[PDB]
Structure formats: C-alpha cells, structure tokens
Write an enzyme that holds these catalytic residues in place. Structure first.
Site, PDB file in Angstrom:
ATOM      1  N   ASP A 296      85.595  29.634 106.062  1.00  0.00           N
ATOM      2  CA  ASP A 296      84.485  29.117 106.860  1.00  0.00           C
ATOM      3  C   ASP A 296      84.817  29.192 108.338  1.00  0.00           C
ATOM      4  O   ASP A 296      83.926  29.301 109.179  1.00  0.00           O
ATOM      5  CB  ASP A 296      84.184  27.669 106.482  1.00  0.00           C
ATOM      6  CG  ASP A 296      83.578  27.549 105.105  1.00  0.00           C
ATOM      7  OD1 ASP A 296      82.368  27.823 104.962  1.00  0.00           O
ATOM      8  OD2 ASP A 296      84.317  27.195 104.164  1.00  0.00           O
TER       9      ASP A 296
ATOM     10  N   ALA B  96      79.259  29.999 104.527  1.00  0.00           N
ATOM     11  CA  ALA B  96      79.348  30.347 105.941  1.00  0.00           C
ATOM     12  C   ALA B  96      78.465  31.532 106.347  1.00  0.00           C
ATOM     13  O   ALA B  96      77.516  31.373 107.114  1.00  0.00           O
ATOM     14  CB  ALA B  96      80.810  30.612 106.325  1.00  0.00           C
TER      15      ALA B  96
ATOM     16  N   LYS C 159      86.769  25.871 101.593  1.00  0.00           N
ATOM     17  CA  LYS C 159      86.378  24.807 100.680  1.00  0.00           C
ATOM     18  C   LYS C 159      87.565  23.964 100.259  1.00  0.00           C
ATOM     19  O   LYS C 159      88.606  24.492  99.870  1.00  0.00           O
ATOM     20  CB  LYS C 159      85.716  25.395  99.430  1.00  0.00           C
ATOM     21  CG  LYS C 159      85.164  24.354  98.460  1.00  0.00           C
ATOM     22  CD  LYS C 159      83.706  23.965  98.758  1.00  0.00           C
ATOM     23  CE  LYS C 159      83.532  23.378 100.141  1.00  0.00           C
ATOM     24  NZ  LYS C 159      82.128  23.006 100.417  1.00  0.00           N
TER      25      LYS C 159
END
Ligand SMILES: [Cl-]
Ligand SMILES: [Cl-]
Lengths: 340, 340
Positions: free
Chosen positions: B232, B48, B243
């Site tokens: 993220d 990110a 993830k």
C-alpha cells in the site's frame, strides 16, 4: 464434581457446549461412552486437560454401557473408541491409560463402578489443584503491570477449572498485579474470541481480542511484555505441540526479544517421545476453514488445509511452567529430572 | 472503461461491491464525489491501486457536483473529502494530486470535464498495463511447479484489472508454469478467502485457502516455495506498508529461508518519506474484529485493536517487483535509480 466446563451427575456427564459460546451457555448431557466420544470429537468439550478428565468419565460410563460378552474386550473397545477421537493431546491417552489400569486391578470387585468413578473424581479434583499450582509458579515470571498475549484457550474452559496459561494470569491478578491480556481470536474455531475472552471478562480481567495476523506487529510495536500459552503435547525434547499458530508467535517472539512461556501440567509431557517430530498432528474438517460460526466465507468448492496444531522447537521457548516448577534449558536434561 | 472492479458510465462510477463477495456479485453506482468517498471509506472498493483510479473518477464527478461559489475552493474540498477516506495507501494521494494538477492547468477550458475525465480514463488504462508488466517481471522469479503463498488481495479486485501480486501469478501461469496458491483468508475483512480465492478460481488457477495462523507452520513444513504479496505504501528506504499480517509472514519467511517478494507499481512508492516509520497506519472500526463478515463472534462489550496495515522493514524483503524492473538491495540506492 461441578464446574463451568463439566458436571458429574453420577450417571451422566454434563459438558458446557463450548462450540456455542460466548452467547449461548447451554449444556450437553452424555450418558453413553459413545456420546462422550462424540462430544470430544465435535469439540463440544475441548482443551487437552479437559479432554482427559472428560474422557475418564466416558470410560466410567463405558462400564454402565456393558451388557454381554467379555467385560475386558468391551472395556478395551470403549477405551479404543474414546482414544480414537482426537490425536494430538496426549492428556487423553494419559487419562485413559490411568483409568484402564485401575480397571484391570478391580475388574473382579463388585464395587467396580464405584471404584472407577472414584478415580475419575479423584482425577478432576487433581487437575484443578494442579492448575492452581501452575498458575502460582507462572505468576512469579509476570512483572506487575504488564501486557500478556495468549493463544487459543488454555483456561477454565480447557480444564476442569482455573486453567493453565490463564491460571498463571488469574494468579498474578490474585497476587494483586495490574494485568491485561491480548487474546488472539485464534481461527478457525475461534477459541480466543469465543472462549478466552468470555471467561476472562467473566472474571473481571482486562481483555482485548485481536485477529491472529496482528500479534506480530503489536509485538514489534512493543505493546506485549510476554507471550504465555498452553500446550497439548510436550516431548522429552521440550518441543511442544499446541494450537496451530503457536509456532509463529514463538518465532515472532524471538525476533522481538519477547519471553515465550508454555504453561502446562506434567501430564501433557509425553514420556514416550524424544522430539516434537513424533507428535501426531490432527487434521480437521474443511468446513471449519470455509465457514466462520455458521456462515460460509470462502467460495463454493474451494480447497483448503486445516492443521489443528503446530510444533514449536524447544529452542524458541523460554521456559515451561509446571505444577512442579519452572523448567528451563537444558529441557531434555531438566524435564527428565521433573518426570521422576 | 469496463472491468470486474469498476466501470465508468461517463457520468457515474460503478464499483463491484467487494464487501459482498464471493457470493453476491452486485455493483454500486456512485454519482457524487461523496459517494465515491463513501465507497472508498466503507471498502466497497479497495486495494491501493484501485482506490486511486476510483478516487480519480470521484474527482471528475466532483466537478459534476459543482454549483456555486469559487470553483477552485470547491474542487479543493472535493479533493480533501476524497483524501480524508483512508490514510495508508499512497496511491490515493498520488492519483488525487495528478488529477488536481490537470485541473489547475485547464480550469478555464470550456472542455474541463472532458479533459479531467480523460486523464482518469488514461489513468485506468495505464494501471492495467502497468500491472501486466509487474506480472511479467515477477514471473521470472517464480520457478515452475511451485507453491506460492499470498496475503490479502493484491489481484484483479485490487486494481483496475489483472492485479499486482496475482498478476505475477497469472503471468507465470500464462507462460505455462504449473502453479498453485496458498491464500491466507486474511482477517478481519477476509480479502483472501472472499476475494483472492474467488478471482483465482474464476481464472482457473489452483487455489487453497488457509487461516492466517497457518502460514508459519506450513512454511516450516516446506510446502511453500515463495511468498509474494502486494503493498500500500513503500518508502525510499524500501520498507513497505501492507495488509496487517504481512510483517509476520516476512519474519516467518526469513526463519525458513523463504523468498519474500513485494509486487507493486512505482505509484506505490512514496517519494516524500525516508523510512517505514513515516507511514500512516489506518485504524478501522472495532466491529470488523468482533464480527466475522456478518455475525458477532466476540463477547458483547469487549475491547479490541484493529490496525489495517503493518510495516515490514526492507531488510526482510528479497525484492520489489515493479513495472520497471525487479528492485534489490541496496533498496534506498536502487529505488532512487528507478524514480529518476
Ligand atoms: Cl533458535
Ligand atoms: Cl534482519
């Protein structure tokens, strides 16, 4: 005796090299009890149920290896060399113990080899029969048109044939139920992606492969109706040792109110232990983690851990599917009933 | 601007090809906004934080790519081509939006290119600084001599430098605390085994790599003191997208009463969404699952699913480590404080 997992040529044991699938379908011929031990140790053959029958034969070959000194001492060493291969699965010891018993009662018989080989044969033919029964009992628990998640390979390649957890699946499909299986690839060995996927596609059963870190989310998203897996060692407690990662699924299953089933033959129930903390847990080579089918994936000289199994407390299990019926809580109370 | 993840040559962006580590340490030169897009789309660069700065630079190259027609329409398209690469991480849009604003206010400036590039550089230098603050804020939560589990790669290679979750670690180590990290390899891409392990060993920080299906059992065995990961996209709710596999760890963490921490810069908190159900979830190519780094592992023609992220409800998160402080429940209430 002839199936995809193994074949008995009377004087040798052919094993499908499971560490080479799904692309290569070759076989390994074991002629010495030491080779069967090697095949087991290297996972050429694997899956609790299949390790036993295969172990039973290596024992028969063990006799065919005899040359000098006491027959008893030597057969004791053959048994010890075979049992010393892999810890966790109790089926191995169960098989070896059953075989050694036959031996002690016919050691003086001239038709010893014929007798021992006979039990091994009798044993293989029983595993397939025991499995088809497990499948049958489990099917009733699988509602038509559902998605079942599995772990490792508790199917054809893990047994003489049919399988345990995958047996339950084949049976539900045979009954005529629309079914599809989400199969974790199951690292590091990748039994799921290399074995489960393969034998399932080869049987015309809807299959999807997902990475292990996926099962959790997919359960939360409501795509999985039930989780069914096999086992390597179930205690009187009901706690069951299975492929590393089985425990986490059990946890994730409770969190998403999803049925968690353990499909295994009675021979996987260790009668000498009370709880799951008494189950030995195999630790394999570091390579399995740092590599993936040949190529090294992790940096050179990295440290790792590699447990091959974990233990799931009975309180996280909905039921245990047996060739003798579906066991439910209280496990310690009911398992004691089935055992006799 | 020169670090391991990326380098700005003034008229091109060099990215460490993260899809080749830990063995090959080559770089990829991007000269067209499209190449930076491609690099982002293919995960040559990833994480990110780093996707943003990298996107910000590909934006200035976007200007360098200008030739005819309206300058506004073209810059709008450059931004659109760059934003259309990867869904989930909001750092990308946050960066693109910040850059476009600067553009809109200096479009008529003769020194447009110098101005835009200047913000990008100003952005990279801020990310590294923001991270060291996150590291410091998180260090206080880590007790000396503890084992910390991580997921994916929220470290140096996921940011301009230092990292977020790994920054928290580097900082605890800098403070002089004996620390070791259990890093999930994190399939299918294997950010853990290929990146986290790598940058951690290169920094002289004790590291172990384990397969994803292991974290659960290892937590139950009491070898993990705390779980720290990156993110993220975090919603006002506190729910965080990370993830795939992060959600399961959070679940397993609660079950074993283990602290679960999310380390991320404020720039990862999406202010336009209320809860985690509003976070887009990227689905990548099937190849990532059927193959492992290079070789095909699953049977030919198999079905798979491939979510690149999952969402963890805020109620499973102990705290969110930010460059502005450690956020704790009530998240919605507190996050609203940090934002203003
Ligand atoms: Cl419980
Ligand atoms: Cl909760």
């Amino acid at each position: 005796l002839k199936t995809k997992t193994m074949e008995w040529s009377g004087n040798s044991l052919k094993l499908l090299d499971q560490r080479k699938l799904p692309f290569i379908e070759e076989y390994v011929e074991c002629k010495t009890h030491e080779e069967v031990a090697h095949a087991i140790k290297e996972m050429i053959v694997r899956g609790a149920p299949a390790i036993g029958v295969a172990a039973a034969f290596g024992y028969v070959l063990g006799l065919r290896d005899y040359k000098t000194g006491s027959l008893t001492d030597w057969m004791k060493q053959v048994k010890e060399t075979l049992a010393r291969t892999r810890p966790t699965a109790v089926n191995l010891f169960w098989a070896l113990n059953r075989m050694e018993k036959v031996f002690f009662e016919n050691a003086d018989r001239e038709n010893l080899f014929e007798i021992l080989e006979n039990e091994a044969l009798k044993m293989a033919y029983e595993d397939i029969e025991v499995n088809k029964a497990i499948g049958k009992n489990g099917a009733q628990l699988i509602k038509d048109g559902s998605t079942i998640l599995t772990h490792c390979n508790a199917g054809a390649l893990a047994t003489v044939d049919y399988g345990t957890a995958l047996g339950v699946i084949r049976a539900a499909v045979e009954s005529g139920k629309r079914i599809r299986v989400f199969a974790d690839e199951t690292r590091p060995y990748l039994q799921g992606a290399r074995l489960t996927a393969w034998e399932l596609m080869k049987d015309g059963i809807e299959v999807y492969v997902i990475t292990d870190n996926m099962a959790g989310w997919l359960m939360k998203r409501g795509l999985i109706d039930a989780v069914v897996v096999g086992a390597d060692r179930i205690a009187l407690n009901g706690d069951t040792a299975n492929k590393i990662g089985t425990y986490s699924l059990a946890v994730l299953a409770k969190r998403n109110n999803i049925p968690f089933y353990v499909a295994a033959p009675v021979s996987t129930i260790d009668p000498t232990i009370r709880s799951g903390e008494e189950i030995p847990i195999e630790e394999r080579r570091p390579e399995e983690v740092t590599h993936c089918g040949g190529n090294r994936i992790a940096p050179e000289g990295v440290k790792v851990l590699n447990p091959a199994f974990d233990v799931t407390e009975n309180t996280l299990i909905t039921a245990i599917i047996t060739e003798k019926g579906v066991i439910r809580p209280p496990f310690e109370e009911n398992i004691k009933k089935i055992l006799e």
